[PDB]
Design a binder for this molecule. Structure first.
Ligand SMILES: N[C@@H](Cc1c[nH]c[nH+]1)C(=O)O
Length: 323
């Protein structure tokens, strides 16, 4: 009853009193379980340090950094079903999103391990998802502390963004890939925090592939005339200020081009995750440098203290985050 949950097929299942082994279906889930309690994680989905997520050894437990890779259901990856089954997690937590649910449900049937799914596409859902996972894992006080900070940060951002008239919303281009020529649709789980932060995302469409990465030409970016450019890849961030042709863009002239922080988890994407609680504030601070009413460096410090148990010096803020 207290241990009864609706599973991925909407059927009530009874979990063990104590979950000592758990597996997340994809990095958004695994990263979230980490900050609640890494102890029961049987594995990770991707390499702990990769192109989009850096410096983990400085921020994350040694236990987490030494976990084996078991794959997952997400872009450019596939699950290791035999290994997952062999590792005997008490429960699997999955990512409830339409482009992944079919394949996930199929494979989970084959595995025959209890599985729950959580809906994290709207970042406003993070508080309730944290509380839910706290009940599942019997880590209620920890998960509730995270949920409360999440709720506060999300409410503050919502109230701020509501104060910006629609005609005054900052035009933003999300520059992905090594050459800045991939982007996301304005409606995509890869670009959600840009819209949540009050951005007018210049490329208009609806995501129809898991990975996104819509192709856009240089000539199209010029037409879009973004006011701010948010950049994922550090090679592009250098290129856009080194190569003369990008100086046609007003954002480049005004130096309103910003590299997304990645230490230890990406602040905005690859994966989408609870980091967006902070990342969307960081984005808002860049979109609205005169109107944004909070001190972003203090939000970073408070967020890292609670979520990661890490104290950041002013030099750390510069080194890892350019803040
Ligand atoms: N330079 C980091 C990102 C970053 C650091 N400070 C601000 N952003 C990278 O490797 O992508």
């Amino acid at each position: 009853e207290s241990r009864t949950f609706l599973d991925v097929s909407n059927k009530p299942i009874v979990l063990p009193e104590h979950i000592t082994r758990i597996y997340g279906s994809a990095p958004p889930i695994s990263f979230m379980i980490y900050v609640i309690d890494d102890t029961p994680l049987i594995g990770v989905n991707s390499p702990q340090t990769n192109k989009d997520n850096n410096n983990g050894e400085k921020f994350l437990s040694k236990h987490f950094m030494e976990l084996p890779i078991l794959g997952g259901w997400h872009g450019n990856n596939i699950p290791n079903l035999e290994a997952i089954l062999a590792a005997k997690p008490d429960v699997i937590i999955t990512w409830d999103t339409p482009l992944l649910n079919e394949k996930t449900a199929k494979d989970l049937a084959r595995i025959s391990i209890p599985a729950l799914k959580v809906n994290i596409d709207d970042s406003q859902n993070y508080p309730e998802v944290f509380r839910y996972l706290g009940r599942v894992m019997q880590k209620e006080e920890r998960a509730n502390a995270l949920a409360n900070m999440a709720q506060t940060y999300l409410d503050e951002l919502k109230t701020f963004v509501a104060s910006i008239p629609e005609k005054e919303r900052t035009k933003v281009y999300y520059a992905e890939g090594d050459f800045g020529l991939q982007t996301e649709c304005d409606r995509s789980f890869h670009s959600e925090p840009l819209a949540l932060a009050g951005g007018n995302l210049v490329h208009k469409c609806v995501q129809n592939s898991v990975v996104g990465l819509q192709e856009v030409s240089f000539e199209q970016i010029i037409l879009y005339d973004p006011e701010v450019i948010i950049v994922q890849n550090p090679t592009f961030y250098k290129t856009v200020f080194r190569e003369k042709k990008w100086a046609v863009l007003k954002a480049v002239q005004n130096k309103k081009v910003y590299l997304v922080p990645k230490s230890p988890f990406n602040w905005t994407d690859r994966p989408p995750s609870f980091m967006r609680i902070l990342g969307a504030h960081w984005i808002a601070s860049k979109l609205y440098p005169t109107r944004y009413p909070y001190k972003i460096e203090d939000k970073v410090k408070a967020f890292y203290q609670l979520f990661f148990g890490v104290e950041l010096s002013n030099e750390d803020l510069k080194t890892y985050f350019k803040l």
